[PDB]
Every structure is written in C-alpha cells, then in structure tokens.
Amino acid sequence: LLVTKRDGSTERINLDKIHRVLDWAAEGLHNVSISQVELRSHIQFYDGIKTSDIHETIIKAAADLISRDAPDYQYLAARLAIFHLRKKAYGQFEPPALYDHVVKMVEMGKYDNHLLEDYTEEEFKQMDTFIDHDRDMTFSYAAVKQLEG
C-alpha cells in the first residue's frame, strides 16, 4: 500500500522511516520507548494515507506518554513536533536564510515591511550568524504546542 508524501508524490509504506525518525527523537533520552510510541499511535494505515497525518499521530502518542516515571517524553514529543513544524513552514528541516525568509514574508503581507527599510541585506545576514537553530532542541512539548498554537 501507498502513502502520500508532503510534496504530493506517493511511495509504498516503509516502517523504517518511522523507526528512524523516532530513534532520532529519542537519542540521549532516558526511559523512553520507540516501541511504545508506535503502538500507542494506533495508526490505521489506508492506501493513500497522508504522511503528515502519520507524523501528527505519533506526536500525540509520545506527548501523552509524559509521566513521572518517564519525564523525558517531554523532549521526544518536542523534537518530533519541532521536526513537524519545520516541514510545515519550509518543506525541509533546515530553515532558509533570514533575509530570504523576511523578503518572502513581507511580500506575502505576513511581516511588517519596515523590516526591509530599517535593515539592509548585509545586516540580515549578520543576524543570521547570531541565530542558533539548535536551540529549538531545548524546548519541552508544552512549549512547542504553545508556539504552533
């Protein structure tokens, strides 16, 4: 059976894709279980299932496993949610340059155009060196849900 990728294309189902993304999200964490997240997802595969619905399902499952006995699920679900939010806004994991993003966002009317008037392209590229995108890996799950919500 086939799933529907984020770009619209289709390919046959491969659970290793789910295993890999969970292994990455659980790296370094204590008392978490890749097996538990997949089984608590209760994911019902149908032919043509959206790959983004699959990811949202395993985010909710790992998020609901947050407990006193396994508090590190707060970071596993956050890393999965950060990963999901990266794809929604950029179509990829790595965010674009700050200048290229601001230009596109002002043209769409989502940012204030004063950003392009008060800062030059050389200044935007200089603020891109300030940014550390790995700081998205220090949030907890509750933080990310308030961010996206």
Binding site: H30, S33, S35, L39, S41
Partner: protein, 357 residues
C-alpha cells in the same frame, strides 16, 4: 537403584531436595520448603483449558498480515511449540528420579502437566490460524534456525538423564562396562543437575519471554487477540515455572540443602554465566532471522535485542550471576500489561475582632 516406594521410613523434612532417599508417602501437611507448596496451589488455581478461549477471529487477522509478518508470527509459534514440547516431558524424566522431598516431587509433575496444556493450546492456536497444521508441525524438527537450539537445550537434559541412570544402576565408583572404564561421580551428577536447572531457567525466564514480546506486540495492535489471551495464560504459568527454578538454584547455591552443593555451584559459576550469555546471543540471532524481511509496528531487531539484554540482566541477577550487558530501561514497557494482573456559613465576629490591621 531407583524405587517407586522406598521401604525405609525417613523424616522427609530432613531430606535434601535432590539425591536423598526416593519419596515414599506423598503428604502435603508439611513442607521443608514451602515455596513449592505455594507454587502448586498457585498453579492449581490457574488451571485453564485452551478451548475456553475464543480464537475464531484470529484467522481473519492472520490472513490479512503481510507475508513477512505471517513469517514472524509462525516462526515464533513453531519455536514455542518446540520449547514446551521439551518442557512437557523433560522435568518428569530428568527430575523425578532425583527428587527426595514430596512437595518438590509434586510440583515437578504439576509443572510438567501444565506444560502439556501449553502444548495443547499451541495446536489449538495453529488449528484456528492456518489451513493445514501439518505444514507447521512438520517444519519444527527440520527447521535450521530452531534445531540448533533444540539440541543445545535438550543436551543438558539428556546428559543429566544418562548420568542418573548410571548412578542408579552402578552407584558411585570406578566401573567397567564392556571393557571401557566408567567413573560414576555423585559430585559430577550434582554438577549436571545444576547446569541443567540453569539451562532450564534461561529457557523459561529468557527464551520464552523473548517469544512473549512477539506474541503480545501483535495484540498491542489489536491483532491475533485470541492467541494473545492464551499466551497471557501461558505467561502467567511461566512466571511460576521460572520462580521454581530460581528457588531450586538459590537453595543449591546457598548450601542450605547440601553443604557440598554450595562449593559445586561456585565451580560452575563461569560455565553458568557462559550458558546464559550463549542463550542471550542465540535469541538475538533468532531476532535477526525474524526481521530479515522487514519489521512491524512496535517491534524490530534493535527493539527485540534490547529486550534480550534487558531481560537477561534481570534473570542472571536473580540467580546470583554477573550482569553481561549494560544497564538498561525496559525497551517495551507495554509488555508488563500482559505479564502481571457547600460552604460553612457560620462566622464568629469575636474571633475576627482579634485581628489587628
């Protein structure tokens, strides 16, 4: 020689677990070790029959599985049928000629009997999941991945049975049997028993629990739910079985039963450690064979191998052996589900007047 009713009146409370006078009168009003009386009562209270579990809707789920998941399920079911086939007869044949207290004698027969219910349920499961049960059963003896462990497991039993027969026929000493010289050592017999019990402990406490992980993973997906109910009943029995061998081993190791035995158990510590490590390694390779064509939701080679290391450390510590693997948390915590089961309006102004603002 072995006698089915020893003529000598002995105080059964003072006999050892093994190698003493064969049990004559079967009484259950007193025990040397009450753990085996508790194990009998617990087992008798768990009495179940395979036919009392509905397995009719399991055939639908099995046919719908992918081909590599049919293989995972059936390979795990063939391996279970093998192990409880050995366990059906072996405790009776290997231990009854050695036991010298009645409560341990009756437990071994209750232990062996409950294994026959397990074997009967495997036929019940197979009969309701595949079209020809002969296809599955005929593959058990010839299976290349299974047979290597079947001979390994049965050899510890076979060697104990052989020395026991020599010990009953000839007694201790140096004997001549058709020219060739044969030495019958009771100390060597005690060593073959201790190694056998260690092999049986790893069989029931590690090998089967790796198999439970496969069966219960399907149930966590609400599949094969009739099989999982039966395996749940088996796992409840299996917990009693490994508790029995744990108490046998620790009683032998501690020297409570036989002063000589505590020293013999120390000489075997390295061989027992290697026995468990080899058992753990064989199951990891078994997991490598299970997922060669793909994995499933909740279970793959890494996850199952991590459970092997997790469960082995727990079992080896229970019998006083060194931990061969790194400390780890339970990689499949879901398996524990299957292994254990208007205002008071009165005011006092005087009390408030005590307030200084």
């Amino acid at each position: 020689a072995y006698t089915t009713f020893s003529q000598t009146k002995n105080d059964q409370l003072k006999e050892p677990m093994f190698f003493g006078q064969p049990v004559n009168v079967a009484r259950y009003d007193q025990q040397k070790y009450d753990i085996f009386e508790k194990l009998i009562e617990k087992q008798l209270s768990f009495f179940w029959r395979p036919e009392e579990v509905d397995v009719s809707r399991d055939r639908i789920d099995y046919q719908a599985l992918p081909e590599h998941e049919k293989h995972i399920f059936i390979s795990n079911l063939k391996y279970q049928t093998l192990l409880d086939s050995i366990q059906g007869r072996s405790p009776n044949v290997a231990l009854l000629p050695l036991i010298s207290i009645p409560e341990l004698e009756t437990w071994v027969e209750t232990w062996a009997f409950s294994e026959t219910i397990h074997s009967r349920s495997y036929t019940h499961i197979i009969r309701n999941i595949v079209n020809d049960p002969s296809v599955v059963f005929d593959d058990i003896v010839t299976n290349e991945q299974i047979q290597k462990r079947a001979e390994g497991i049965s050899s510890y039993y076979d060697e104990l049975i052989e020395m026991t027969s020599y010990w009953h026929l000839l007694g201790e000493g140096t004997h001549t049997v058709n020219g060739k010289t044969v030495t019958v050592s009771l100390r060597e017999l005690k060593k073959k028993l201790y190694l056998c019990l260690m092999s049986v402990n790893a069989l029931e406490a590690i090998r089967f629990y790796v198999s439970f992980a496969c069966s219960f993973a399907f149930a966590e997906r609400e599949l094969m739910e009739g099989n999982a109910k039966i395996i749940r009943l088996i796992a409840r029995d299996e917990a009693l079985h490994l508790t029995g061998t744990q108490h046998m081993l620790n009683l032998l190791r501690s020297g409570a039963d036989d002063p000589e035995m505590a020293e013999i158990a120390e000489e075997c510590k390295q061989e027992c450690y290697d026995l468990f490590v080899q058992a753990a390694q064989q199951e990891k390779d078994w997991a490598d064979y299970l997922f060669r064509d793909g994995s499933m939701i909740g279970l793959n080679k890494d996850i199952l191998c991590q459970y092997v290391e997790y469960i082995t450390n727990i079992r080896m510590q229970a019998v006083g052996l060194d931990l061969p693997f790194q400390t780890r948390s339970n990689p499949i915590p879901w398996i524990n589900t299957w292994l254990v089961s208007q205002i008071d309006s009165e005011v006092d102004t005087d009390d408030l007047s005590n307030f200084q603002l």
